[model samples]
Target: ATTVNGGTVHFKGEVVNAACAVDAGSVDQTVQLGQVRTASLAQEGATSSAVGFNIQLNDCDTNVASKAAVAFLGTAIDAGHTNVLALQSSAAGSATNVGVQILDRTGAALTLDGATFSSETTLNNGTNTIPFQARYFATGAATPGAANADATFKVQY
Candidate 1:
């Protein structure tokens, strides 16, 4: 009676060669693209207003990593649409013919393939913010529903 079974807790993370630590706030972030009208995605390649986001690196050791770049990783992207992220089919009422597109600070679409990294940026000793944007992009005639994509970021040194 003194001993009781309890669920085990496990912790996990990667030890990276990069010198900067990802800011806690930047981890597990959610960017709401808002509710856009289905008619807005009538034209192919059309996109709704882009929502800006930032990834912050804290206490970066410039000596260890002078340059850094980021790439998005997820299986939710399709090869035909190499730059846009597809919605989760399992999600109830998941949107069709519409996807999310990530853009770099320069306003160019970032390839969704994990191999494609953003432009290398010089790191500072303190904190640094990498700016990006995401928007709803039209692939065809969109059917209205919840549109969400889950993706992770990898930093390259």
Candidate 2:
């Protein structure tokens, strides 16, 4: 008879490539764009003052990838601003003719098409902060109401 005191142990884990881990604070963050007057976005292409935001990356290993980029994913708004993120319809009293626009560190608007990545950023062996900005863009005649957008992002290698 065999002794049953010793049992088999099973271990499971994943060996993923060396990629920068997104910092806890960088995940699920909200960027507050202060209230702006309707007149500020009265004309098409008008935009409100930009508010700065950033994503922090930690435990980055340069051996895997030497560069990284961010892609803001959202539904694009119409009216010539196809790259702007559309206001969430679920938001109560959503504003009309206003959408959210994301800008890279250089202040150029990003195309929030999910597949479009921002300018490449050279990676370091340590932590890094990717800077960005957000502003309200006018698609047409501005109307007074609450304007909000829900956007997701992905870090590309």
Candidate 3:
């Protein structure tokens, strides 16, 4: 009878001069997500006007998600136009955190020319449209009479 012997194989090695390289190139491109501006119209001093348009934000931000900012442009009267009424976030499902305040272009405090914020609520999301109404009855007539007042607002993410 013949006896068979078993043998084992062991291997050990080191990679001394291994290196990695990558070819890179400069990138110059643009992405068009579309853009829009805020605008509105009235009967040149009827009673009030509705800003029924969607104003998109540059991009969603952490601090701005659920916050609303408003700015007005026009003359202030003492008597008749003593109130700037706004009905914001009237659309379905669209909710917003209503935080309304005014500021003068010169960085001064804004005392509505006889106006006040009517509603304040959280804005709904997902195409939930809403309505914003503002009335200009400030005693003295508007400089150009219901010409055009700019209202700037921002939504939180």
Candidate 4:
């Protein structure tokens, strides 16, 4: 007997509106905020040491709008926890009550809900650096393993 099989495959992603190409360093790079003490992040809104990084732009288009901004878009912690980014998957200890927050150049926390804040930088059609920082925010009582979160920066041209 002759038979046929059918299945489905899913595809994703879209044409992005970009002003300049995102530098390789910022592409899926992990900013490890290592070995933070629980007491440091115990108080509500408390922040750990800031880890600096950048979303560098390269090979920008000259004629394109030089005014560009970056927005954090990813899993939200919650309404009340808007400032904190949801943990991707943390270890069993030390990470129980910790959340991560992205900080701008001014040291203000940037919400991960994707609507509140952005980092604006001017480009001359070539290369530019949008500096940012990350710190752990204490959402509740801390327990103990590894603490980490992930988010993507959307370029708003």
Candidate 5:
């Protein structure tokens, strides 16, 4: 279970690989592993490259009636190995949601798969620490929105 920084809300449970489930109560999260690389190869031959994984966010409870905005925080390794962290959501529903922003060290937003609020996904190189957080906001609202979503991740080195 995970706890909010300023609140007493505790989110529990585990996110299975390649499955979708409800989290706290307002956000939807998904995990997937793509390709894997085992054993090294010679330079002239085909060397096994690192594997890739994705954590997708959706169904964020929009501030208005059916819209929400989210942002992502974490690290990305170049060629070194890294760990895959867990991601959780605190919202409900499948559609009508906003995407997340991938920020750099300078706090500038990076381009996602393409376009903003479309795909809230990130990658882990396979040896450093990647810390990420997502926050959502309703439309035309003064205060930010809230949900009970959170996640914990584990990886095999």
Candidate 6:
């Protein structure tokens, strides 16, 4: 004769190398380039006024700090529009051949397909804020109703 017994085994999980916080409570952030005239883009490779912001990291392990990175995430920039961040939707404005571009402190461009720069490589054990900027890039000229652009990012450690 034999006795049989069975016990339940529960699963446990903990996340490490977690993501850092943005300046605002929510990850959804916006940059507004107010009232850029359509005629301004007539000249080649013209850009509108830029808005600046930063990503803030806090309450993170040093493991994350030692080797942190940022990559803009969204649709890839099109063939004719190098480095331009495609608007999440069709042109919000009447403006044609328009897109947005993100710039680093050194005046270099960034994209979602995974471009790296020293600006994002350096991280502090405590709160560290990474600087960035967003602006409209024009490949052609047209009328405008409303112009806006957006991009999300990933923090890799």
Per-residue error at 58 for model 5, in Å? 28
Question: What digit string (tens of lDDT, one per residue) describes model 1 on residues 1-157?
Answer: 6998899899756565558898878777777766899777897777788778889988888777689888987654557778777776775677788888788876787777688888889878798998888888887787876766788888888
lDDT preference between candidates 4 and 5, better one:
4
Residues 6-31, candidate 5: write the lDDT tens digits: 74677666664422223343235443
* Winning model by TM-score: 1
Candidate 3 C-alpha lDDT tens digits along 36-138: 1112222233332222222332222333356443433334333333233222333443212111223232333344533432233344433233333333222
Off by over 4 Å in 4: 1-18, 90-94
Cα error of candidate 1 at position 29, Å: 1.5
- Of candidates 6 and 5, the better by TM-score: 6
The lDDT, on a scale of 0 to 1, for candidate 4 is 0.71
lDDT of each: 0.79, 0.80, 0.30, 0.71, 0.29, 0.65
Full ranking by lDDT: 2, 1, 4, 6, 3, 5
lDDT of 6 by residue, 1-157 (tens): 6989999999644354364544443355555567777777775588778889877766655663466666776564476555776655564444556777788887877755665533545665567777787777776664566554566666676
lDDT of 2 by residue, 65-149 (tens): 8898888778877645668888788656777877888888776877777787878899888889988887777867999878778
lDDT of 5: 0.29
Query: lDDT by residue for model 4 over 1-157, one digit each (tens)?
Result: 8899989999643455665777666676666666877667666667677778877777889686758776787776677766777778844543566787777776677767666657566677577887887777776677777656777766677
Candidate 5 stretches with Cα past 4 Å from truth are: 1-100, 114-126, 142-157
Worst 10 residues of 4 by lDDT: 11-20
Pick the winner on lDDT between candidates 1 and 6.
1
Regions of model 6 farther than 4 Å from truth: 1-16, 19-26, 63-65, 89-93, 115-118
Flag regions of model 2 displaced more than 4 Å.
1-16
Candidate with the larger TM-score of 2 and 6: 2
Colliding residue pairs in candidate 6: none
